[PDB]
Amino acid sequence: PLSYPFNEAVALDVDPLYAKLRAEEPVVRVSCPFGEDAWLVTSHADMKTILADPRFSRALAAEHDESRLTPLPIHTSILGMDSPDHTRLRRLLAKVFTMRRVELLRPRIEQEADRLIDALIAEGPPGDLMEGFAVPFAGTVVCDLLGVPFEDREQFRGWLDAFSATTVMTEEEIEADTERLHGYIAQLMVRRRAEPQDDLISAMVKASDEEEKLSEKELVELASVLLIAGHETVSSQLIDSLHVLFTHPEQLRLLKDRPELMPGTVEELMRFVPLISHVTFARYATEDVELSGTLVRAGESVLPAIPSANRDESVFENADRFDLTREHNPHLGFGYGIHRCLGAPLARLEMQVALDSLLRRLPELRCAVPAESLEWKDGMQVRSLLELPVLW
Ligand code: HEM
Ligand SMILES: CC(C)[C@H](S)C(=O)N[C@H](CO)Cc1c[nH]c2cccc(F)c12
Numbered sequence: 001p002l003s004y005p006f007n008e009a010v011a012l013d014v015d016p017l018y019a020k021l022r023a024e025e026p027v028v029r030v031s032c033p034f035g036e037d038a039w040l041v042t043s044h045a046d047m048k049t050i051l052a053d054p055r056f057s058r059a060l061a062a063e064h065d066e067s068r069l070t071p072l073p074i075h076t077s078i079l080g081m082d083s084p085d086h087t088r089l090r091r092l093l094a095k096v097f098t099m100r101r102v103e104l105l106r107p108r109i110e111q112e113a114d115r116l117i118d119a120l121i122a123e124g125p126p127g128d129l130m131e132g133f134a135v136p137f138a139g140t141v142v143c144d145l146l147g148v149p150f151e152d153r154e155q156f157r158g159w160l161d162a163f164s165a166t167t168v169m170t171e172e173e174i175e176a177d178t179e180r181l182h183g184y185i186a187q188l189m190v191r192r193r194a195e196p197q198d199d200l201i202s203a204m205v206k207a208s209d210e211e212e213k214l215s216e217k218e219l220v221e222l223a224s225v226l227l228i229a230g231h232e233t234v235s236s237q238l239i240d241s242l243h244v245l246f247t248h249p250e251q252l253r254l255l256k257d258r259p260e261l262m263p264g265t266v267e268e269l270m271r272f273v274p275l276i277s278h279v280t281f282a283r284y285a286t287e288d289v290e291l292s293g294t295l296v297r298a299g300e301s302v303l304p305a306i307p308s309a310n311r312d313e314s315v316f317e318n319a320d321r322f323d324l325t326r327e328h329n330p331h332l333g334f335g336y337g338i339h340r341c342l343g344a345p346l347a348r349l350e351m352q353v354a355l356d357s358l359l360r361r362l363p364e365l366r367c368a369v370p371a372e373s374l375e376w377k378d379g380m381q382v383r384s385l386l387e388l389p390v391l392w
Pocket of ligand 1: 051078090142226229230234237280281333334335336338339340341342343344346347
C-alpha cells in the first residue's frame with residue numbers, strides 16, 4: 001500500500017498525483033500515519049457517495065483504530081456521530097443557529113471589518129492581513145456568536161492547534177491541550193447557565209436543559225468544535241483566498257469592476273482553494289460498496305480527499321483554473337449530505353464582507369513580497385499563511 005500523504009503540502013499547490021489517480025485509479029489503498037490502512041478516494045462522484053450514502057459511517061470509526069493523520073482521534077462531537085445521536089445534536093443547532101441569527105450579525109460583522117481596516121491604516125503599511133485582519137476578524141465574529149470572550153484569546157488560542165496538528169505535537173501535548181480547552185468551555189457553561197447572554201452557548205445550554213437533550217460533555221465538545229471552526233477554518237480560508245486573488249491579478253480586476261460577482265467569487269474560492277491539507281475525517285463501510293471499480297469491504301475505511309474532488313475535470317471544466325465567473329460549481333468545500341457544514345451561511349457572510357470591505361477601503365491592495373518569500377503553517381489539517389504582508 002502507498003504511504004500517505006504522498007508529499008507534504010506546499011503553499012496552495014496540489015500534488016500532481018491526484019490528477020493521475022482521478023484518471024487511472026480513482027480509489028487506491030494507502031497506509032496512514034496513524035491507525036489502520038484505508039482507501040483514498042479522489043473523484044467527485046465517489047466523494048459524494050462516501051459523504052452522504054448511509055452505507056458509510058462516522059460513528060464506526062470509534063470501534064476501530066481510526067485511519068487518520070493526527071496522532072490521536074479528534075473529538076469531532078457531532079461530526080463523529082451517526083443517527084440517531086447526530087440527529088439530536090443537529091436538531092439542537094438548527095433551532096438555535098438559525099439564518100435569522102446569522103443575518104442579524106451582519107451589522108456587527110461589517111463594523112468589525114471597518115474597525116480592523118481603520119487600525120491597519122492608522123498603523124501604516126506594510127500590514128499583515130493574517131494577524132492584522134483575518135485572525136482577529138474570524139475570532140471576534142465566532143466569539144460574538146458563541147459567547148466565548150474574545151479577551152480570553154491569549155489563553156485559549158494556544159490550545160486550538162491540538163485539534164488539527166498532524167506531525168508537530170506529541171500525543172501527551174495533544175491530550176493536555178484538549179483537556180484544557182474542554183475544561184475552559186465547561187467553566188464558561190457554568191457562568192452562562194446562571195447568567196444567559198445573547199449567544200449560542202447560552203441558547204444551547206438553555207435548550208438542552210429544558211428537554212435534557214444533551215449531556216454536559218456533549219455540549220462542551222460541541223461548543224469546542226464550533227470555536228475551532230469559526231476561529232481557525234474561517235481565518236485559514238480567508239487568508240488563502242486573499243493569496244489566490246493576489247496571485248490571479250486579472251480575476252481581482254474583474255471582481256473590482258463587477259462587484260455583483262462576489263457571491264459566485266466566494267463559491268469559486270471555496271472550490272479552488274485546497275483548504276483541507278489532504279483529507280477530511282475517515283468513514284467506515286457498513287456494507288460492501290464498489291467505488292470506481294474498487295470494492296470497499298465492510299469494516300474498511302475511506303479517506304475523502306475533498307480538494308481533489310473539487311479539481312475533478314469531469315465535473316468542472318478547466319478544473320485547474322480559477323475562474324470567479326464560474327456558474328456551474330457543485331463544489332464540496334462545505335461538505336455534502338448528513339455532515340454538510342452548518343456554519344456555511346455564516347462563513348459565506350464573513351468571506352463576502354471581509355473581501356468587499358478590503359477592496360472598497362484599500363483599492364490599491366497588493367502583496368508586499370514575492371509569493372516565494374511567504375511562510376506557510378505546516379503540520380495542520382488545513383493550509384494557512386502565517387503572515388501575508390501587504391501594501392496599499
Ligand atoms: C470557510 C470556513 C469553513 C469551511 C471551509 C468549512 C468546511 C466544512 C466541511 C468541509 C465540513 C464537512 C466535514 C466532513 O464531512 O468531514 C464541515 C462541517 C461542519 N462545519 Fe464547517 N466550515 C467552515 C466554517 C464553519 C463555521 C463557521 C462553523 C460554525 C461555527 C462550522 C461548523 C461546522 C459543523 C458543525 C460541521 C459538522 C456538521 C455535522 O456533523 O452535522 N463550520 N465544515
Ligand atoms: C472539517 C474540515 C474543515 C477539516 S478536516 C478541519 O478543519 N478540521 C479541524 C481540525 O481537525 C476540525 C474541525 C473543523 N471544523 C469542524 C466541525 C466539526 C468538527 C470538527 F472536528 C471540526
